[PDB]
């Protein structure tokens, strides 16, 4: 039930998220683009600084008036093929170097922590106040610096499949925002898009997103979703923790199979007023795919001995999820104190460094960082016994992978539907049917991906916003309108890209998309979007 206090909490969370995104963008620009800073910051340092900034900002709001507040989604920096889960800790730099010695240079940016020109950096972070969660995610491009131009500007725009992915993600984000804002004014929906008397449907969402992706020659990564957000139920760990009820549209390998052949989420809903929606879209480029293939995900482990592949990434996830349905008394006093600290976080993923007493740092000092690492050692000692008794689980690091359909069709599975992963610790991904019609399980699909010689990794671009459908009493101007709590032209400003693809204006869906854009730009007789502003610091 939307109300004044709920709206204020959502707005405050969105403002803090926007300010944090501006802070990380400024730090990355000053380290790699402006190059005025003496020292280039690395990815774990940027993540730690982001989390400290978020905590210091959130300290001043709703103090002793809200039971639970903090970081909802820990800061994540995903580069290219990595599509999520990359939040490495500061005590793992040498571990990453030792683990990935003797490998290829494909994941060199993630291994070293230093960004390189031509990289797609996806920054994701979220903030919750009293269970009301606002999350933002934005893709940006790293550019080389021109030496002759008086002002710091890129030498040239991004070109190719990465540009295709960024353009597809940006345009799909804007189009979905406009379509969802059209739910409050059902009379402004174009006839070509759908019924004038009809509302907004998950089928319409799916066909618009798929039309944009197919027009830009990109695939929707199976992590993407457009869903509804409630209190403490924001999909902060969607593939891990099961939810009783789901109202949204998701994309999977099963959906790819259905398109090619043309608790459970279903695209058979109607968007209602007074609701909060999360839109996370990941587009993977298909530039190097000479055939028709399937987009899926690969999990990264920390075992260098499982294979001989030189292009393999070996890493350890940095974020953990607490399972409050499981209880087991630990033998270690360190483990018991760590679990006491973990239970204070709540139902959101957390980092080990977030549990330290030093964090967040007030005066950033080398001695403070040393005390933080000293705490991290004992935290890892406690976490070893915590995870071994299934009290907490890891959020996996994932890479987008492309598998051709001919290999899948030629393959044989003697078990079919019956097979599943019996050694999988997590329940939800262990029992999975990525291809229900072909009867191919997740373990069989992983076998196919490993056995295929032409299974490649696709660069991914991400855009994720949070919106609220404010009614007449909820909104200020006495008419319903869309409030974008995170993202917009100020924080999520698109990078300099150029792509050779475009929407074809001869399609009914494309014409509907263009009419949505025009009606959104019409600020008098069109749609009304209010964008949350990042607060000043200095």
């Amino acid at each position: 039930i939307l109300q004044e206090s709920v709206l204020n909490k959502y707005r405050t969370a969105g403002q803090i998220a926007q300010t944090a995104l501006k802070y990380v963008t400024s730090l990355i620009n000053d380290s790699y683009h402006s190059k005025t800073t003496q020292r280039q910051l690395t990815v774990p340092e940027l993540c730690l600084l982001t989390d400290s900034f978020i905590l210091t900002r959130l300290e001043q709001y709703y103090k002793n008036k809200v039971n639970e507040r903090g970081i909802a989604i820990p800061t994540t920096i995903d580069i290219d093929q990595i599509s999520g889960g990359w939040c490495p800790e500061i005590d793992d730099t040498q571990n990453l170097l030792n683990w990935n010695k003797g490998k290829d240079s494909t994941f060199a940016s993630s291994v070293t922590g230093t960004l390189r020109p031509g990289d797609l950096v996806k920054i994701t972070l979220g903030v919750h106040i009293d269970g009301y969660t606002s999350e933002v995610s934005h893709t940006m491009v790293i550019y080389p610096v021109d030496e002759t131009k008086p002002i710091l500007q890129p030498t040239g725009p991004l070109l190719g499949g990465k540009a295709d992915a960024v353009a597809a993600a940006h345009i799909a984000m804007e189009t979905v925002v406009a379509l969802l804002a059209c739910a409050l004014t059902p009379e402004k929906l174009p006839a070509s898009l759908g019924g004038t008397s009809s509302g907004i449907t998950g089928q319409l969402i799916r066909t618009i997103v798929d039309t944009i992706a197919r027009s830009y020659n990109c695939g929707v990564v199976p992590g993407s979703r457009v869903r509804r957000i409630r209190r403490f139920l924001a999909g902060q760990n969607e593939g891990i923790v099961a939810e009783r009820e789901y109202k949204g549209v998701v994309w999977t390998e099963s959906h790819q199979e259905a398109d090619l052949l043309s608790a459970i989420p279903s695209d058979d809903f109607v968007v209602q007023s007074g609701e909060v929606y999360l839109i996370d879209l990941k587009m993977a480029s298909l530039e190097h795919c000479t055939k028709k293939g399937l987009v899926t995900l690969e999990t990264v482990d920390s075992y260098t001995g499982k294979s001989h592949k030189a292009g393999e990434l070996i890493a350890r996830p940095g974020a953990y999820v607490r399972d409050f349905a499981q209880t087991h008394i630990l033998k270690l006093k360190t483990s018991r104190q760590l679990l006491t600290k973990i239970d204070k976080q709540g139902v959101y993923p957390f980092k080990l460094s977030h549990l330290s007493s030093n964090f967040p740092f007030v005066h950033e000092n080398e001695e403070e960082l040393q005390s933080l690492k000293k705490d991290l050692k004992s935290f890892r000692l406690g976490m070893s016994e915590i995870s071994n008794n299934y009290l907490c689980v890891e959020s996996p690091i994932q890479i987008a992978r492309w598998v051709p359909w001919d290999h899948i069709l030629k393959a044989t599975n003697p078990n079919g539907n019956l097979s599943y992963d019996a050694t999988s610790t997590l329940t939800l991904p262990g029992h999975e049917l990525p291809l229900p019609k072909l009867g191919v399980s997740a373990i069989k699909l992983k076998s196919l991906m490993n056995s295929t010689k032409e299974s490649i990794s696709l660069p991914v671009a991400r855009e994720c916003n949070t919106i609220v459908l404010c009614d007449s009493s909820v909104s200020t101007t006495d008419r319903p309108e869309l409030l974008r709590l995170t993202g917009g032209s100020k924080t999520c400003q698109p990078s300099w890209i150029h792509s050779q693809h475009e929407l074809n204006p001869q399609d009914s869906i494309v014409q509907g998309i263009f009419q949505l854009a025009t009606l959104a730009k019409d600020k008098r007789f069109g749609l009304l979007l209010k964008e949350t502003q990042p607060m000043k610091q200095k």
Binding site: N29, V166, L260, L409, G439, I497
Partner: peptide
């Protein structure tokens, strides 16, 4: 066979531009 029919259908079905942003660092 339903699996045979699905595999046959899958085999039968598989067998300017745009510019965003500008010369600046946001």
């Amino acid at each position: 066979s339903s699996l045979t029919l699905v595999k046959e259908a899958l085999w039968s079905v598989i067998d300017q531009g745009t510019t965003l942003g500008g010369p600046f660092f946001p």
